[PDB]
Amino acid sequence: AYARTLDRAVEYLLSCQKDEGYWWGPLLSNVTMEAEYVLLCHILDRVDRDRMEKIRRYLLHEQREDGTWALYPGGPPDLDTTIEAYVALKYIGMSRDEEPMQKALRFIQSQGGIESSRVFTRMWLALVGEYPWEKVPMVPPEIMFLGKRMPLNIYEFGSWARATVVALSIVMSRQPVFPLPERARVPELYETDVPPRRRGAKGGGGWIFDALDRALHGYQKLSVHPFRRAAEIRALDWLLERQAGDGSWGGIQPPWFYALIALKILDMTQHPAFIKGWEGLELYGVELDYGGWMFQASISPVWDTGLAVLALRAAGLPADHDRLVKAGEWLLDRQITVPGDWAVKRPNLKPGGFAFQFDNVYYPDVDDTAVVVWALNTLRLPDERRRRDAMTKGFRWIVGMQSSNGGWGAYDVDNTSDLPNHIPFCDFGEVTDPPSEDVTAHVLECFGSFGYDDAWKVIRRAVEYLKREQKPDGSWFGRWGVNYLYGTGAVVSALKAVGIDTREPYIQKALDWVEQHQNPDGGWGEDCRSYEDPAYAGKGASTPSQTAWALMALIAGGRAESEAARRGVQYLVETQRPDGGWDEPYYTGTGFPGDFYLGYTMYRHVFPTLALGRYKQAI
Amino acid sequence: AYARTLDRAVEYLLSCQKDEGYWWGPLLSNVTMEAEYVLLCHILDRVDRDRMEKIRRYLLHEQREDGTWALYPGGPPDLDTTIEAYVALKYIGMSRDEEPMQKALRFIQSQGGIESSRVFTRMWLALVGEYPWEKVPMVPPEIMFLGKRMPLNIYEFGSWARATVVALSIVMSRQPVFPLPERARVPELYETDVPPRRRGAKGGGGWIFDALDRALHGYQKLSVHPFRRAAEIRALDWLLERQAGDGSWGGIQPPWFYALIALKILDMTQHPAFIKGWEGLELYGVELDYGGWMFQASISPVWDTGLAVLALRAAGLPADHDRLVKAGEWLLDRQITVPGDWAVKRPNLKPGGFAFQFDNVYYPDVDDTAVVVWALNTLRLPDERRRRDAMTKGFRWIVGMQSSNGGWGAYDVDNTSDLPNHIPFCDFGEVTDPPSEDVTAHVLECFGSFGYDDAWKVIRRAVEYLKREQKPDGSWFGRWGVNYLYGTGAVVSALKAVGIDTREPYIQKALDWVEQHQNPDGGWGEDCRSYEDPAYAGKGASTPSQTAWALMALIAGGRAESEAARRGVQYLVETQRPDGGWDEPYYTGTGFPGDFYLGYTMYRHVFPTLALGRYKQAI
Numbered sequence A, B: 001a002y003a004r005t006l007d008r009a010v011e012y013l014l015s016c017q018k019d020e021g022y023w024w025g026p027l028l029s030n031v032t033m034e035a036e037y038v039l040l041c042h043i044l045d046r047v048d049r050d051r052m053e054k055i056r057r058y059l060l061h062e063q064r065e066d067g068t069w070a071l072y073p074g075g076p077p078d079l080d081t082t083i084e085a086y087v088a089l090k091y092i093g094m095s096r097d098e099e100p101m102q103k104a105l106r107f108i109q110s111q112g113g114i115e116s117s118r119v120f121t122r123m124w125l126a127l128v129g130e131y132p133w134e135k136v137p138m139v140p141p142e143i144m145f146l147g148k149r150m151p152l153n154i155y156e157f158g159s160w161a162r163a164t165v166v167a168l169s170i171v172m173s174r175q176p177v178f179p180l181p182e183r184a185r186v187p188e189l190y191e192t193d194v195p196p197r198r199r200g201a202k203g204g205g206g207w208i209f210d211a212l213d214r215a216l217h218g219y220q221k222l223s224v225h226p227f228r229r230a231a232e233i234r235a236l237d238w239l240l241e242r243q244a245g246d247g248s249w250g251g252i253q254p255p256w257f258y259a260l261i262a263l264k265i266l267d268m269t270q271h272p273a274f275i276k277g278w279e280g281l282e283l284y285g286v287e288l289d290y291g292g293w294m295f296q297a298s299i300s301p302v303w304d305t306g307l308a309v310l311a312l313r314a315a316g317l318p319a320d321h322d323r324l325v326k327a328g329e330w331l332l333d334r335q336i337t338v339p340g341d342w343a344v345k346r347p348n349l350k351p352g353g354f355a356f357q358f359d360n361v362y363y364p365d366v367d368d369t370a371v372v373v374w375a376l377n378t379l380r381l382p383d384e385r386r387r388r389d390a391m392t393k394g395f396r397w398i399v400g401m402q403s404s405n406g407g408w409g410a411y412d413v414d415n416t417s418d419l420p421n422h423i424p425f426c427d428f429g430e431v432t433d434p435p436s437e438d439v440t441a442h443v444l445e446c447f448g449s450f451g452y453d454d455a456w457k458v459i460r461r462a463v464e465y466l467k468r469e470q471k472p473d474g475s476w477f478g479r480w481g482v483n484y485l486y487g488t489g490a491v492v493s494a495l496k497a498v499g500i501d502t503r504e505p506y507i508q509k510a511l512d513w514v515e516q517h518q519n520p521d522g523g524w525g526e527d528c529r530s531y532e533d534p535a536y537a538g539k540g541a542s543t544p545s546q547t548a549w550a551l552m553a554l555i556a557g558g559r560a561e562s563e564a565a566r567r568g569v570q571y572l573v574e575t576q577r578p579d580g581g582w583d584e585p586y587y588t589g590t591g592f593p594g595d596f597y598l599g600y601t602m603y604r605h606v607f608p609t610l611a612l613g614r615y616k617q618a619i
């Protein structure tokens, strides 16, 4: 029955693999990427008429009937995302008269206009001269003077936010303005009677910071800022030292873009760092068959490759399958061997982790590391030497990354400060990188493959962490994946691996929860709204990935030979395409709960296969 | 008579010009470049068998019958140069038995062996483990803490020495060792009964520095060096901020090589800076028709282009000659507009100078700037706007670069410290960049083209400087050119331009000096030995360039219609080749008096033309 499904799913994944021997599916987000890119080109004075076209088709194509744009497909209209898309289009050529512009402008005004947008949005508009810098949260270069152990030092923020802060400190230090031609001016973003509904700091704002900010803007108007020069250089150098091999900065859109602007401000357009940083952008771009063009918020070659292997293995292919070997080999040349920012908290820890993208040595993450090591432990490479050695290095690194609460973070250790969550500037997405259930789970299952059970203290500490985090309904939150089905599926699958007794109460209470949300069509689904409204927790249209996750939870809990079990398997078998793939018009990935969502292209093919592979194991 | 000579010389230069519209002749030096490059590859673990071959052919080809190598063609054997060539060859494959190696080893031992070599030589050998670091002058990273106005701060050294010191401070901080395979070990460099004849600091050594050094080596053995870490980073950042656009550092061989090694020591082989720096090397390499390969100590595209223009103009071609326009345009896109290290002494000076090579924004020099501006002032470009503006910027910059003594340096202002000349480390070539007669002269002649005469104070201050520097025999020293004929030719030509009366006494005393050295064959020549022995002052085999220089001095002094005058002109006319070019088996360029000599490929074609052009003007 499901056999043909697997066989078809397998040959498909094998056809997606590149020559080098890795997998790499595009990462979807929202139009703010492309929109901001347009503004960036304007800033760097490097506009390409041809590209603009492709970007225009894209923007319109992603606009809904109401004339707005959302964070995820089928999601509510987003003000910020729309405002930025509006500005972008108008710059390219669109006239405020054309319908697309009209319906968009409407929604924008019905929300209070630009005064209701996030910080970044107002900041970008400030860079082009459509908004006063004075009304933008200030972030001084002096922040570079804070010591390793001081309130608000760059190392208390998340790896992703850190670089951004450093880059912007230079930008906000000079508060440059790159005027837009008259035809592009967007004053209409102000014309609104609706009261401005501003968004506050993530964890709430304190009058202290509020005052401090007001002070900073004041100190900004003075005629002399002692030691500011040094502060700027401190930031410039910080950036120059961590620039990624591909020319990026962290492998993410934000810091990369701001770093370039910063360099432009310091008249360093003819400096290697800049040149490389600029031309490196193309690698993240993507040509769309309908004439459009998009910019990936980030790339997941390693991540995809890793899962893809574990999927094909659990499917059936030999541990020494010549094709899977290519992957193994490839994955070995990716391992990092130099210290990263994580070393600031673990100076005596030996490098050995892996990154999300191709070349990003200074920012390896636990999640990727775990999956890559785990994936290798299931293969038979020609040179058992480096394979054995590699796993060892990565293994140890992961262990040394374990936080205090026994849980694991993504990039840093005990990065659980709370101060940054109250700063005026931080009002969008996460700002810190605390331990998460999903990451932890992946780690445990990684060790499990080796054998390390509940006996080992490290494992126990983690298990306890998970137990204390479990939700009342017996489910587990999903940090980097949408959502409770993602997390619960991870935990259970992990706990099962570490030797824990699947018969346990809290465990069962979880499995039951899964079955209770199985949609009528036999599959599982969870809309991204589950991050805003708890009512959607476990609710949503059925998707190949989410269905596979909830499926793994059951197969792991022994309920593989159950009704809901076989039921879900039926879904995957039917919904499968003639080529052996799967479709998924919805996002199942998460960047920042309630603020940024991702669309993992490979998920729809990988997980479904991994699930069917594990189901064929229970029988 | 000389007409045909000119017409042939012109069409030749025009055939050398590249498509872009510039000239670029290879720069010759000595085998230490290629030799050290081989060691560098060994260090960076990037040896290319094929390249090694080409490098071997070169080395042997440059070896004389006695089995040695010299700084300049026809010069005495050099210990350092030979030792490095010896080591290089042995690493490539040569056995110490083969004749070439034998005769070389001889000369080396007859000089006291490795103990008699310069600092760098012993240092390189120390990097490969053939010499103890303990016996190598120490240079601490802490040197980075010295303030702008303190004894021995990095800004008291010459631009060329500065970067080198910064890079090496990191290297000597870790004192790394990259062992050579047994077959390459060169212990024979010690086997010698001859007493070691060590070379001391350039300006003599003081027991202070001697003691200070002994102290530094002691502090180097301690278990804890407080703040050294910061010191290292201070250097790393300094380097990362000034890396040239082509990936080099200053556009010269030394710092470029050491910067790479330094980055290798800090495990930054996967950092953009390194990558760019490594692949950038190829641009300086050169394929030799006989199968050899050499590495240029530096490149002179701008310099060649500049002179080439002034030459063709003085020759006859129209100020708007479509071909010369290409040059003009090209030269305009080269002008620098950002601050360089020179700004540390002139913070309120507006950028506008030019560099020696293609892309080297942080290190423009007065000599190039002057010549480039002067060259432009003789052309009629389509966009008179940028031409007028460019000249203005460059003009002003030059003026703001004038030193105290009324003279002009090369890269910095009043870079006349004396402390660095006594440090143990500095025992090869110049270490500071004080004002020179030749540079100054070029500057004066640059202003002259505009009209500014002796009336202007700036001009007077310079003229006085020249008068006070003139040698007893009425000649002028040649800093960046070999030598007295080069300098005297420059000064006189300049003074004539600034309106000074050519009939003056000191002037005449100079012209006479010129005529007095005219070789029998009618031409002029000055061997590089003139820097060691004053007896060779003005003596040496006749060369196209030197003959042209002494010729300009006469033509400028009004003695154009003289015997010696017409005599020299005859030489150039006869010695000219069928293609219209000229040969010159000798070096006429100077890097460091008595230590480093250069071979400017274009000189033999440019100056001879410029001379004939100015002779055709006097008639």
Ligand SMILES: CN(C/C=C/COc1ccc(C(=O)c2ccc(Br)cc2)cc1)C1CC1
Residues within 6 Å of the ligand: A160, A252, A253, A254, A297, A298, A303, A356, A365, A367, A368, A410, A428, A429, A480, A590, A591, A592, A596
């Ligand atoms: C390492 N893990 C989890 C992390 C995945 C990466 O996810 C992203 C990717 C990009 C962004 C932004 O572009 C962004 C946009 C706006 C701002 Br403000 C900042 C960053 C954000 C998050 C791998 C195994 C799955």
Ligand SMILES: CN(C/C=C/COc1ccc(C(=O)c2ccc(Br)cc2)cc1)C1CC1
Residues within 6 Å of the ligand: B160, B252, B253, B254, B297, B298, B303, B356, B365, B367, B368, B410, B428, B429, B480, B590, B591, B592, B596
């Ligand atoms: C700007 N002017 C004058 C300067 C010319 C440049 O000349 C050089 C070039 C290279 C070197 C070294 O490689 C060197 C080798 C060994 C050490 Br130790 C340091 C540097 C040295 C000098 C132009 C108009 C003519």
Ligand SMILES: CCCCCCCCOCCOCCOCCOCCO
Residues within 6 Å of the ligand: A229, A232, A233, A236, A266, A268, B241, B242, B339, B340, B341, B342, B343, B344, B362
């Ligand atoms: C990073 C702060 C930018 C403000 C300083 C730039 C002004 C240049 O100062 C001149 C000092 O001499 C150093 C020059 O080399 C410049 C490269 O450093 C990069 C740009 O700051």
Ligand SMILES: CCCCCCCCOCCOCCOCCOCCO
Residues within 6 Å of the ligand: A241, A242, A339, A340, A341, A342, A343, A344, A362, B229, B232, B233, B236, B266, B268
């Ligand atoms: C330049 C001093 C050499 C010390 C480097 C050891 C690295 C210590 O890790 C610190 C953590 O910060 C991350 C740095 O890696 C970025 C590049 O900085 C250059 C050399 O590491």
